Amino acid sequence: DRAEDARKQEITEQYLNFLDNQADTFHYRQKIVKMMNDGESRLVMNLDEIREILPERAEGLLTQSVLEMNCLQSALQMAINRSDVQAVVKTGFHVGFEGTFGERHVNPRTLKSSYLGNLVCCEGIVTKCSTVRQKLLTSVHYCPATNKVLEKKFADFTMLDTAVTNNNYPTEDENKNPLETEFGHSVYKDHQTFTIQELPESAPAGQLPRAVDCVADLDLADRVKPGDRVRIIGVFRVLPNKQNGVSSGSFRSIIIINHIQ
């Protein structure tokens, strides 16, 4: 376990040195300054540029994508903390990717279970859309009986973070005093789902075209409508299911989006 902690410290240090190099050859520090002046909260990186300076990070970022991406976003937060500009945004800062994918450029027909857990880039036509809806992230409560403030965090399978918790909404103190929600301090995020189908120029003749489901959050919501031709970058993942303690072995799969073109 401690070796895993040491490796994560090493990986975050490598990404932090790449981001906040003393004379930045790739100018991502100046792009961070532009991002914080504009009030945006995600940074777009060239995977081909990471590939030159840290190829052992870049090729591992495709196969072991979850741990590498978590380490990269932690390094981005430390790089922001070194600035003289202040972190206004209550949601964290995020990363999207562009570049050369090769093996992992796919279609809804060719996305199959060998690719689960990997970063992928996929193409198609938007065929459905949910309306934008708000989702709880953290809740802040005031205890009037004791003048203390309680907080709670929430997590879900559709989020990149693997960690899980009880997800019960708190109502009482440990001393069973009642609690009051602070709506001005609790944190929510915008949420949307959609689906993409094969392009009609590529689907083989006679057969029905195949399709894939997609999840988008925060600034990526409210960007698409039906009929749009899109290229989408994200992690391909699987979702379990339960009914009365009996589980069918057939699970559902989605793409958790990082970036849209």
Binding site: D48, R51, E52, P55, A58, E59, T100, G102, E103
Partner: protein
């Protein structure tokens, strides 16, 4: 009846086709007679800018130009592509980029040696790394019966054909003994 010694690959059709390719280049204004573009290249007027006349020329002709000239690397050998191929070339379709990949690269190095020694050395290092990443895959791929060698360069095709020939011979000898 007099004899002239020439190159060891004088009669090679593949080498003649490799010499027949052309690259993008630029010539200084007024340092060469503008009859040249109609005489050699068949172009009525050169395209002109502040840097010089900009054209494409073949390699056999470019070796004869003892005057000043300059070279721009083609798309398949540009520096971003050099970084991509040096990063991972193990499964890329080199024949889709260029059917005479390594040969045209070696010609480009010999031409660029006088203009840009650092760029010439960088491209040579890239070529060595690219071939080292792929030779084992070629020699392994030759042993399958269903392989057809779609993606390989003309240089890599020789190794592929020799491997498939050896596999056919040993399988024919083995299947006598049933």
């Amino acid at each position: 009846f007099e004899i002239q010694r020439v190159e060891s690959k004088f009669f090679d059709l593949d080498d003649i086709i490799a010499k027949s390719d052309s690259t993008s280049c630029t010539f200084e204004i007024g340092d060469l007679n503008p009859d040249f573009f109609q005489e050699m290249l068949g172009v009525s007027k050169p395209t002109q800018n502040a840097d010089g006349y900009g054209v494409d020329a073949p390699y056999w002709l470019l070796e004869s130009v003892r005057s000043s000239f300059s070279i721009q690397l083609p798309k398949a050998y540009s520096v971003n592509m050099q970084n991509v191929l040096n990063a991972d070339s193990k499964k890329l379709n080199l024949s889709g980029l260029q059917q005479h990949f390594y040969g045209n690269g070696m010609q480009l190095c010999r031409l660029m040696k006088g203009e840009n020694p650092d760029g010439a050395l960088s491209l040579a290092r890239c070529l060595v790394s690219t071939l080292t990443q792929r030779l084992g895959e070629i020699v392994s791929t030759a042993t399958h019966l269903q392989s057809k060698g779609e993606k390989f360069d003309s240089l890599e095709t020789k190794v592929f054909l020799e491997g498939k020939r050896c596999k056919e011979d040993i399988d024919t000898w083995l299947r006598q003994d049933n």
